[PDB]
Every structure is written in C-alpha cells, then in structure tokens.
Amino acid sequence: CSVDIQGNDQMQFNTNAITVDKSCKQFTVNLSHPGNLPKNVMGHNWVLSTAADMQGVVTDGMASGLDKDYLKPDDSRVIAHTKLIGSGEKDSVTFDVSKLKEGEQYMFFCTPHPMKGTLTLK
Ligand SMILES: [Cu+]
C-alpha cells in the first residue's frame, strides 16, 4: 500500500501510472528527487486531484508561490499532496483510499512543472 516515485532535474517523474490495491485502507507515496538542483529552481511536489480539478489547483498554486509549496492553502480539491522538495530531499504523503470514488478520473502532478500521471484503483 505504498509506491516510491522520483522527480529529477529534467522535470520527469519516473512513473506515469500508480495503481492502488483495493485491499488498502490508506496509501502512501514516497517522493524523492535525484539530481543536483535545489528547491527554489527545480522543486517538485506530488499532488492528487480529479482530472477536472487539476487546472485550478495548478493555477491557484502558482499564485500562492514558493513558500506555500506552490499550493493554495486548504485547497479542498487536493485529495493528497507532499511538500515541495529539492534534490536529495524526501517527503511522504498518506491518504485514505476511501476518498477515491468510483467512476472518477484521478491524476497526480507537480504544480510548478509540466509533469503528470494517472492514479487508478486496481
Ligand atoms: Cu516537478
């Protein structure tokens, strides 16, 4: 009921797709950042929302800026998020799998940089 994911200096996540076993009550994403660039220039986060909500989350996050991890505080569209990390840093986020609803399309993404993928219940 966890996955390890990396974001590198070339703005790439090392997976495009996360699958969550339906046996899981909670799920944990462990984000890391191979490379050499720091948080203020090549910081990554990992953010989960519906596909429909992603644009507003990113836009509002960029308006909130760097010290708010490029996320709007208390954004109710964000189902789960890590903090922003630079190279060498790590952050894990855990969420309740029952927040993922049948029939919905979930996406994971970084807010400052064009990086995204799918999250699906197995
Ligand atoms: Cu990123």
DSSP line for 2-37 = EEEEEB-TTS-BS-SEEEE-TT-SEEEEEEE--SS-
Among 10, 38, 20, 31, which residue's Cα sits nearest to residue 98? 20
Contact at 8 Å (CB) between 93 and 82? yes
- Please report the resolution in angstroms: 1.4
Q: Give backbone dihedrals phi and psi of 55, rounded to 5 degrees, phi first.
A: -55, -45
Alpha helices in the chain (DSSP H): 39-42, 54-64
Task: Please give the method by which this entry was determined.
Answer: X-ray
44 is in an annotated binding site: yes
Pairing of strands 2-6, 47-50: unpaired
- How far, in Å, is the centroid of ligand 1 from the Cα of 61? 13
* Fold classification of 1-122 (topology level): Immunoglobulin-like (2.60.40)
Token code pair at residue 65? 């800026």
- How far, in Å, is the centroid of ligand 1 from the Cα of 8? 8
